[PDB]
Design a protein around this ligand. Sequence first.
Ligand SMILES: Cc1nc(C)c([C@H](OC(C)(C)C)C(=O)O)c(N2CCC(C)(C)CC2)c1-c1ccc(OCCc2ccc(F)cc2)cc1
Ligand SMILES: Cc1nc(C)c([C@H](OC(C)(C)C)C(=O)O)c(N2CCC(C)(C)CC2)c1-c1ccc(OCCc2ccc(F)cc2)cc1
Lengths: 138, 138
Amino acid sequence: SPGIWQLDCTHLEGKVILVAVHVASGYIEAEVIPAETGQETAYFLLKLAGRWPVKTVHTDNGSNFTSTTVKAACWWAGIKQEDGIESMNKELKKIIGQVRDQAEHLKTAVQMAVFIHNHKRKGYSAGERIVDIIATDI
Amino acid sequence: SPGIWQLDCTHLEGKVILVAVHVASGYIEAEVIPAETGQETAYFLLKLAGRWPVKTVHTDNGSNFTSTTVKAACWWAGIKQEDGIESMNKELKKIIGQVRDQAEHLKTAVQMAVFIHNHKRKGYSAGERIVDIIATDI
Ligand SMILES: Cc1nc(C)c([C@H](OC(C)(C)C)C(=O)O)c(N2CCC(C)(C)CC2)c1-c1ccc(OCCc2ccc(F)cc2)cc1
Ligand SMILES: Cc1nc(C)c([C@H](OC(C)(C)C)C(=O)O)c(N2CCC(C)(C)CC2)c1-c1ccc(OCCc2ccc(F)cc2)cc1
């Protein structure tokens, strides 16, 4: 379904990479934060929902599902917060490793990996698939 | 044209709001930074280009057009960096003012305004128009 997203967390270099995957296409958005908190997750969802038509988010764990702050952001943004990827984290870490030496900051390497992941043709790319899926829904 | 974006800067509360407008649709992405620098602009463009198919960016001023750091990000992301909105800044500041009391942080009010701006039906919204324009290009 065009509006379904899945949250995902992974660790790297003492930091956390928070990822949102558009389930039907494999398209991703990602950010680097010091640690996963309800405030960081709520702010990340608010950003994602202003950029794509987010109908449902499958939270990554029970703490984010429980968080009053995350629930408040889902309420504000009109998101249906729902309850309950390893290959995606491994592939994303693999791309980060291939670009790591071109970037001083981890956040720069992570955005380079988001770019490569979304543009990779598998032939359509994930960026093309998300747009085609949502335009068909309009 | 589907791949053309325009950068825009505005000031609020001692901070800078950096905006990227998809010219054909009026869709926006925005971020709050302490001040406009070549590093912040380069990082913002790298994020935008991993999320949308960015072919051309009309920089907001000569400093960003000149910046070796911005040029390096445009080279990395495959963006054609080009040279040379008031109503958009005024409308965005108007929305920020209507939500300002619902947010402690300026960045939260700015993302709420990006959400409202992109979802507002004028009837299609800017979020629907950007997706339809890019899907037609695919
Ligand atoms: C000086 C500098 N500092 C930092 C901290 C970063 C990155 O951080 C942020 C700026 C916040 C994204 C980082 O995390 O590494 C830089 N980028 C590295 C990543 C890149 C996306 C390529 C943008 C520049 C650069 C930099 C500047 C210029 C540069 O120039 C190469 C020759 C070049 C010049 C012009 C061109 F058009 C093409 C290549 C190389 C690196
Ligand atoms: C405690 C708190 N601190 C901060 C700093 C922020 C914002 O910052 C970030 C978290 C980083 C985005 C800010 O900048 O103001 C908050 N949000 C305000 C903005 C919002 C998008 C609604 C998310 C929560 C909240 C907060 C938490 C909970 C809350 O709950 C209402 C009743 C409620 C509870 C559950 C619901 F499902 C619906 C309403 C209200 C405000």
